Amino acid sequence: GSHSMRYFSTSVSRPGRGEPRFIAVGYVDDTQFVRFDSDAASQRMEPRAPWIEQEGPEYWDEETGKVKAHSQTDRENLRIALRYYNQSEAGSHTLQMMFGCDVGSDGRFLRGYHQYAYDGKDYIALKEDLRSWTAADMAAQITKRKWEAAHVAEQQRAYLEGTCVDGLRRYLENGKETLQRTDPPKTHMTHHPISDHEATLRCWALGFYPAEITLTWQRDGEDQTQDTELVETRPAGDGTFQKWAAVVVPSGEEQRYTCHVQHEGLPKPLTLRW
C-alpha cells in the first residue's frame, strides 16, 4: 500500500542538571528502526530493526554524524528560544521535530514534512508545497525570515523528494518481509453483564499491522458513537497492535448490535454479530 518514513526528535532542557536531554527515533510506517539517546554511552545512532543492521559502517558513521549535529543545534535552539520569548533559564522547555516523506504503492513521492514544536505547540512548519514556511507566532517569524534569507527550503525540498524517497524505497526493500506485510486483525466479542438490566459487549481487534484501524458498533444498522467506549490503539510489543470498542446494552437486546471492522488486511470489511 502507501508508506512513510519519519524521524521524531525531542530536546528537553534540564536547567541546573547539565545539558539538555536529546532523543531521536526513526520509523517506517509503524515500525521503529533507529534511535539516538544523548544520555546513552554508545553515543551513536543505534539500530532498532533487524533489517537496518545490514547497513555498512559508512551508514552508521554518517547517520551518527547528522543526529549528533542535530542534538547540538537543538541545544543552541533552546537557548535562542529563551531569548526570543524572554523566558527564565530556571524553567525546563521542550523542542520537538518531525521530519519525513510519504510515498504511494509504487514508491512515488507523495508528501514531505519538516516541522518543529516548542513547549508542545506548533512553532514553524514547511508547507505542503515545500517552498515556504508557516510560523505560529512572532518568535517563529524571526526563524522564518532567517530560513527564507538562508534559502533553507531549496535544500529541504530536494532532500524530501529525492534522498528521503530513495531511502524509504531502499528501507522498504531491505525490510520487505517485514515492512510490506499486513497482518489482519483476529476479532472476537465478549459479554459482560453489569446490572440486572444491562450488559457490555466488547469488540476486539488483535494482532493487526499496520496500526490504522476502525472499529464501530451499530444498532439495527444505525451507527452509534454516543453510547460507546473506544480505547486508543495500543502496541502489543511484537510489532502488532490492539484495540477494542464497547457498548452498554439493555439485557436482552445484544442481538440488535453489530460490530464493524476496517483494516487494509481485510479484503472486505467485517460485520460481527453476537
Binding site: 547528522k66 542535530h70 543545534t73 537543538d74 532567517k146 538562508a150 533553507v152 535544500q155 529541504q156 532532500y159
Partner: peptide, 8 residues
C-alpha cells in the same frame, strides 16, 4: 536517512 537541521 536522518535530516539536516538548522538554527532558529
Amino acid at each position: 536517512r536522518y535530516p539536516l537541521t538548522f538554527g532558529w
